[PDB]
């Protein structure tokens, strides 16, 4: 996260860390939506241009963290994966359209003051909060500058941007399954997700029922916090029926 600040303890109890077994490194961020399912970005697991194709056996999920490199004994929980599900139409060949994946944990995790799931938005919440100008929050243990790793989880609140401005900031083809956020060069405020933050949550707090909803997943950007550019996120509501389907077809 670039130009973000340290989070507070228990601020994002749904933040998850995808951790590689060997070498032992942070791979991406992810979020906890139930006691058995984690949501992340599919390019964190599969990206053939760089020969990336992780399997169950290659990852570990760490829940309840704050510090990036420490094993927070008695606070965090480490789980193993049972199955990984990538959207069948995830497009890694062109624009990372439908960049979403679900992971089923080997065993249910127990909630605590540091572990609690986030809500997935329903048509109406999506309709009232995903408006240009409204701010969301992104968290992660990713890089602090384009080219610089934090010791604690970082947070930054960014405004959602109008689709035409999103489209006119890049040469990549934008689809309806994505949205962008960030400040205009003009607004004199900065911030962005960056390498290492991928897979994590973009959330908004409903002013109607006070709950936090995960509206997007950190997907891509061109550099980190460059002026005239924005970060793109998977549109979770637009891919929610897929989510429901694998969950009730394979578990809960």
């Amino acid at each position: 996260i670039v130009e973000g600040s340290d989070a507070e303890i228990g601020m994002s109890p749904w933040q998850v860390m995808l951790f590689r077994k060997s070498p032992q490194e942070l791979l991406c961020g992810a979020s906890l939506i139930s006691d058995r399912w984690v949501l992340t970005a599919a390019h964190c697991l599969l990206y053939p241009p760089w020969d990336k194709n992780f399997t169950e056996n290659d990852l570990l999920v760490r829940i309840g963290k704050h510090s990036r490199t420490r094993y927070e004994r008695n606070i965090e929980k480490i789980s193993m994966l049972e199955k990984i599900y990538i959207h069948p139409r995830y497009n890694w060949r062109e624009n990372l359209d439908r960049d979403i994946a679900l992971m089923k944990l080997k065993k249910p995790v127990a909630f605590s003051d540091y572990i609690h799931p986030v809500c997935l938005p329903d048509r109406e919440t999506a309709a009232s909060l995903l408006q240009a100008g409204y701010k969301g929050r992104v968290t992660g243990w990713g890089n602090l500058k384009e080219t610089g790793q934090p010791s604690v989880l970082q947070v930054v609140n960014l405004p959602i941007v109008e689709r035409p401005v999103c489209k006119d900031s890049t040469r990549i083809r934008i689809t309806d399954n994505m949205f962008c956020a960030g400040y205009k060069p003009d607004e004199g405020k900065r911030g962005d997700a960056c390498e290492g933050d991928s897979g994590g949550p973009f959330v908004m707090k409903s002013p109607f029922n006070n709950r936090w909803y995960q509206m997007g997943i950190v997907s891509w950007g061109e550099g980190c916090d460059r002026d005239g550019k924005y970060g793109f996120y998977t549109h979770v509501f637009r891919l929610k029926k897929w989510i429901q389907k694998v969950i009730d077809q394979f578990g809960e």
Binding site: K21, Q24, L60, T69, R70, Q149
Partner: peptide, 11 residues
């Protein structure tokens, strides 16, 4: 940079 995590999570 990562601290070691307990062996039982690798198996």
């Amino acid at each position: 940079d990562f601290e070691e995590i307990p062996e039982e999570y690798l198996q």
